[PDB]
Nucleic acid binder design. Structure first.
Ligand SMILES: Nc1ccn([C@H]2CC[C@@H](COP(=O)(O)OP(=O)(O)OP(=O)(O)O)O2)c(=O)n1
Ligand SMILES: [Mg+2]
Ligand SMILES: [Mg+2]
Ligand SMILES: [Mg+2]
Length: 431
DNA sequence: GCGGATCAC
DNA sequence: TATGGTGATCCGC
């Protein structure tokens, strides 16, 4: 299938559903938000643009002088991870389009299926219309976690403080390892094929060694990206996927050359909405992002245009922060419609118990309890309460959540809450 | 501190 | 029949 036909089949499958109504509502909000921004771009004067330009150029030179190109950052990504595990262990799924998940929701797909437009976060019953020969195999998350343990053990040899972003995705700072490796005998960097092979001393070679060891240990392929900061490493991690590598050499000109026509949507932090809004200003590549910096410093908040400027200049984090403490812990769940209040109170109490057990495993207590309600029209509400003393048990948590829920049930009385999802979150952990 | 929005994976 | 779960951040109040 092709990008034109797929959008069509999808449109046919989603049309008229409550889900799609909510999407239309959300798109209208995005549209209006854009219209407003445009009303702002209309009332901007050349004088203000000139002044803003000098402000941004000042701060820009401030960035550019501090550009750090001495670190070597790697982003490792297992290719089609979940589906690749499932393919590794069931030969019958060879050369076939598969996805991992349920008929309600798919977690991931293999490249074969991706060619039919089926992808992560897409309901199975739609992907089936995109590809009726698609094989949906159920998730085996424990397996994935285990394989993930195998590759984490390997990544720890190159940066013990590597930063895992998910089960199949991680950031490495291999600077120090490169330094030690430059005077390593051939013995420390020789490995056997599952009768031996040796890897060189360069960054590309270090990553070829990593990918090699991973493929030996798990029978699965990884792609990687190499660059002076996390932002760039993450972007060029995608460049030669699957089973590929790419490096951006640590010179300013290489960074700039790579950035030049890079769609800003590839950058981590630019989602669909920001992409649409920036597109409204004619900004699609990172150089257009640079050229519009003053206008952006007038249309957007400080944090946002500072961030955009970092993107446009090819800057990004050059050190991995050792994982700080979690700021929240939550549990939520979708179900067939629940509208009777007593049942809703039951689900709330259940979620609270589950949450309390999870808090128990990390021995945490917090001061804020938030509930999440999604009605049958996919409208999401959130209701929090912060309390003087920390709470931890299922009874305490349910004590707060119960009242929040009660308030919401009352606000619509005499109508029942028709909800398809409920959740409970706890935060405000102690300093 | 609260709630909606946005984003990553 | 049927459209997820967890965690984080930001902005405007
Ligand atoms: N909306 C999404 C998208 C992804 N994931 C999870 C499921 C698998 C993991 C990685 O999936 P992707 O990065 O979407 O794809 P992949 O299978 O890793 O394949 P590739 O990265 O090679 O495209 O992230 C998720 O929970 N929710
Ligand atoms: Mg990934
Ligand atoms: Mg991946
Ligand atoms: Mg992005």
């Amino acid at each position: 299938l092709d990008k034109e036909k797929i959008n069509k089949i999808i449109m046919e499958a989603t049309k008229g559903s409550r889900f799609y109504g909510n999407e239309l509502k959300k798109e209208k909000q995005v549209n209006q938000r854009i219209e407003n921004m445009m009303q702002q771009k209309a009332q901007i004067t050349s004088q203000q643009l000139r002044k803003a330009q000098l402000q941004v150029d000042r701060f820009a030179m401030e960035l550019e002088q501090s550009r750090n190109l001495s670190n070597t950052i790697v982003h490792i990504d297992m290719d089609a991870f979940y589906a690749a595990v499932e393919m590794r262990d069931n030969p019958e799924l060879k050369d076939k389009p598969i996805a991992v998940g349920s008929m309600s929701m798919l977690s991931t797909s293999n490249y074969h299926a991706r060619r039919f437009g089926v992808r992560a976060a897409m309901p199975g019953f739609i992907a089936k219309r995109l590809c009726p020969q698609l094989i949906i195999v159920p998730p085996n998350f424990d397996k994935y976690r285990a394989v993930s343990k195998e590759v984490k053990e390997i990544l720890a040899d190159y940066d013990p403080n590597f930063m895992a972003m998910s089960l199949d995705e991680a950031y490495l700072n291999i600077t120090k390892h490169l330094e030690e490796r430059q005077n390593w005998p051939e013995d420390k960097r020789r490995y056997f094929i599952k009768n031996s092979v040796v890897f060189g001393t360069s960054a590309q070679e270090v990553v070829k060694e990593i990918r090699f060891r991973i493929e030996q240990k798990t029978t699965l392929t990884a792609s990687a990206g190499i660059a002076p900061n996390t932002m760039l490493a993450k972007v060029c991690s995608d460049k030669n996927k699957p089973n590929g590598q790419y490096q951006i050499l640590p010179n300013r000109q290489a960074v700039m050359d790579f950035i030049k026509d890079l769609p800003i949507r590839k950058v981590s932090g630019i989602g669909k909405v920001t992409e649409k809004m920036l597109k409204a200003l004619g900004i699609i590549t990172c150089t257009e992002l640079y050229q519009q910096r003053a206008l952006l410093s007038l249309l957007f908040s400080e944090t946002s245009w500072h961030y955009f400027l970092h993107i446009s200049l090819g800057l990004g984090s050059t050190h991995l922060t050792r994982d700080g403490e979690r700021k929240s812990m939550s549990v939520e769940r979708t179900f067939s419609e629940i509208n009777k209040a007593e049942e809703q109170y039951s689900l709330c109490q259940e979620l609270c118990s589950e949450l309390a057990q999870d808090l128990q495993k990390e021995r945490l207590k917090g001061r804020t309890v938030t509930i999440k309600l999604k009605n049958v029209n996919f409208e999401v509400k959130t209701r929090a309460s912060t309390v003087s003393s920390v709470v931890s048990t299922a009874e305490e948590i349910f004590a707060i959540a119960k009242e929040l829920l009660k308030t919401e049930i009352d606000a619509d009385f005499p109508h029942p809450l028709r909800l398809r999802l409920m959740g409970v979150r706890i935060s405000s952990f102690p300093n």
